[PDB]
Amino acid sequence: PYNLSLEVVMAIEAGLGDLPLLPFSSPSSPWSSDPFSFLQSVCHTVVVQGVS
Amino acid sequence: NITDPPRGCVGNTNIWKTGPLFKRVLMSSKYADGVTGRVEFNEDGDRKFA
């Protein structure tokens, strides 16, 4: 409803910033063993993006 | 094989080994305990004949 326009927000592990027009390849670091930090980051990114 | 419950909320990222056996053991007491007495909790885990 209300002429919705779809927007996709990629909640990658990297910090929020302007999307760059250049492919950068770097080695992936191991995931943090604390899931609470990941949950808080996901919640903050969703709130900022207003993800439905 | 009675593994103690895991400690912590972030370190534990697996289900406890003491699962269905622990539930079956817990839902196996049949005595006269408490004011109601005759603890016969079965099926979903609720007593009978109150």
Swiss-Prot record, chain A:
PTM description: N-glycosylated.
Residues linked to a glycan: N3
Subcellular location(s) of the protein: Cell membrane; Postsynaptic cell membrane; Postsynaptic density
Stated family: Belongs to the glutamate-gated ion channel (TC 1.A.10.1) family. NR3A/GRIN3A subfamily.
Role played: Component of a non-conventional N-methyl-D-aspartate (NMDA) receptors (NMDARs) that function as heterotetrameric, ligand-gated cation channels with low calcium permeability and low voltage-dependent block by Mg(2+). During the development of neural circuits, participates in the synaptic refinement period, restricting spine maturation and growth. Forms glutamatergic receptor complexes with GluN1 and GluN2 subunits which are activated by glycine binding to the GluN1 and GluN3 subunits and L-glutamate binding to GluN2 subunits.
Subunit structure of this chain's protein: Heterotetramer. Forms heterotetrameric channels composed of two GluN1/zeta subunits (GRIN1), and two identical GluN3 subunits (GRIN3A or GRIN3B) (in vitro). Can also form heterotetrameric channels that contain at least two GluN1 subunits and at least a combination of one GluN2 and one GluN3 subunits (in vitro). Does not form functional homomeric channels. Found in a complex with GRIN1, GRIN2A or GRIN2B and PPP2CB. Probably interacts with PPP2CB. No complex with PPP2CB is detected when NMDARs are stimulated by NMDA.
Protein's UniProt name: Glutamate receptor ionotropic, NMDA 3A
Protein source organism: Homo sapiens (Human)
Curated annotation (Swiss-Prot), chain B:
Tissue and organ expression note: Detected throughout the brain, in brain cortex, cerebellum, thalamus and olfactory bulb.
Gene this protein is translated from: Grin1
Physiological role: Component of N-methyl-D-aspartate (NMDA) receptors (NMDARs) that function as heterotetrameric, ligand-gated cation channels with high calcium permeability and voltage-dependent block by Mg(2+). NMDARs participate in synaptic plasticity for learning and memory formation by contributing to the long-term potentiation (LTP). Channel activation requires binding of the neurotransmitter L-glutamate to the GluN2 subunit, glycine or D-serine binding to the GluN1 subunit, plus membrane depolarization to eliminate channel inhibition by Mg(2+).
Annotated organism of origin: Rattus norvegicus
Protein name: Glutamate receptor ionotropic, NMDA 1
Highest taxon of source: Eukaryota
Recorded domain comment: A hydrophobic region that gives rise to the prediction of a transmembrane span does not cross the membrane, but is part of a discontinuously helical region that dips into the membrane and is probably part of the pore and of the selectivity filter. The extracellular N-terminal domain (ATD) is a site of allosteric regulation to modulate overall receptor function.
Subunit structure comment from the entry: Heterotetramer; the NMDAR subunits are modular and harbor tiered domains that function in concert to regulate opening and closing of the cation-selective ion channel pore. Forms heterotetrameric channels composed of two GluN1/zeta subunits (GRIN1), and two identical GluN2/epsilon subunits (GRIN2A, GRIN2B, GRIN2C or GRIN2D) or GluN3 subunits (GRIN3A or GRIN3B) (in vitro). Can also form heterotetrameric channels that contain at least two GluN1 subunits and at least two different GluN2 subunits (or a combination of one GluN2 and one GluN3 subunits) (in vitro).
Glycosylation sites: N1
Entry's family note: Belongs to the glutamate-gated ion channel (TC 1.A.10.1) family. NR1/GRIN1 subfamily.
Free-text description of this protein's post-translational modifications in UniProt: NMDA is probably regulated by C-terminal phosphorylation of an isoform of NR1 by PKC. Its phosphorylated state is influenced by the formation of the NMDAR-PPP2CB complex and the NMDAR channel activity.
Compartments reported by the entry: Cell membrane; Postsynaptic cell membrane; Synaptic cell membrane; Postsynaptic density membrane
